């Protein structure tokens, strides 16, 4: 049950790269949400634990995931936050749904492998 951080990064980065490759859908998720810049002062009231692709990448890069379910949980936290805050007609919401479709296909074989 022990995963070296470098091993995790090698196995999990391609799944992250798949999400980054999605244009236009990944662009709202490439950086943390800035509520002041975006003019959405209630964002941190609704979303208690922000997450985005840049933070997930940094966590992979700095060895902050002890095991792979932590990585999957952060990706899903990103998705759930967007589905929670944004209305169903918004680009972010629909883009989130696309990323989730792309992620589920990428992650299955990798998680089976890592076990
Ligand atoms: C709505 C604010 C928000 C964004 C966001 O960065 N918006 C600006 C933006 C930047 C780049 C491309 C975009 C493409 C389409 C739409 C907005 C884009 N990202 C998330 C996750 C949220 C929330 C609240 O969940």
Curated annotation (Swiss-Prot):
Query: Which residue intervals make up region (Interaction with histone)?
Result: 42-88
Region Interaction with ASF1A: what ranges?
A: 80-98
Q: What is this protein called?
A: CREB-binding protein
Description of how the protein assembles with itself and partners: Found in a complex containing NCOA2; NCOA3; IKKA; IKKB and IKBKG. Probably part of a complex with HIF1A and EP300. Interacts with GATA1; the interaction results in acetylation and enhancement of transcriptional activity of GATA1. Interacts with MAF and ZCCHC12. Interacts with DAXX; the interaction is dependent on CBP sumoylation and results in suppression of the transcriptional activity via recruitment of HDAC2 to DAXX. Interacts with phosphorylated CREB1. Interacts with CITED4 (C-terminal region). Interacts (via the TAZ-type 1 domain) with HIF1A.
What species is given as this protein's source? Homo sapiens (Human)
Subcellular location, in the record's words?
A: Cytoplasm; Nucleus
Any idea where the Bromo domain is?
Answer: 3-110
Q: What is the documented function of this protein?
A: Acetylates histones, giving a specific tag for transcriptional activation. Mediates acetylation of histone H3 at 'Lys-18' and 'Lys-27' (H3K18ac and H3K27ac, respectively). Also acetylates non-histone proteins, like DDX21, FBL, IRF2, MAFG, NCOA3, POLR1E/PAF53 and FOXO1. Binds specifically to phosphorylated CREB and enhances its transcriptional activity toward cAMP-responsive genes. Acts as a coactivator of ALX1. Acts as a circadian transcriptional coactivator which enhances the activity of the circadian transcriptional activators: NPAS2-BMAL1 and CLOCK-BMAL1 heterodimers.
Share the record's PTM remark: Methylation of the KIX domain by CARM1 blocks association with CREB. This results in the blockade of CREB signaling, and in activation of apoptotic response.
Q: Which residues of the full protein are shown?
A: 1083 to 1197 of 2442
Q: Which domain of life is it from?
A: Eukaryota
Comment on protein domains: The KIX domain mediates binding to HIV-1 Tat.
Q: What is the effect of changing residue 101 to R?
A: Abolishes interaction with ASF1A
Illness association = Chromosomal aberrations involving CREBBP may be a cause of acute myeloid leukemias. Translocation t(8;16)(p11;p13) with KAT6A; translocation t(11;16)(q23;p13.3) with KMT2A/MLL1; translocation t(10;16)(q22;p13) with KAT6B. KAT6A-CREBBP may induce leukemia by inhibiting RUNX1-mediated transcription. Rubinstein-Taybi syndrome 1: A disorder characterized by craniofacial abnormalities, postnatal growth deficiency, broad thumbs, broad big toes, intellectual disability and a propensity for development of malignancies.
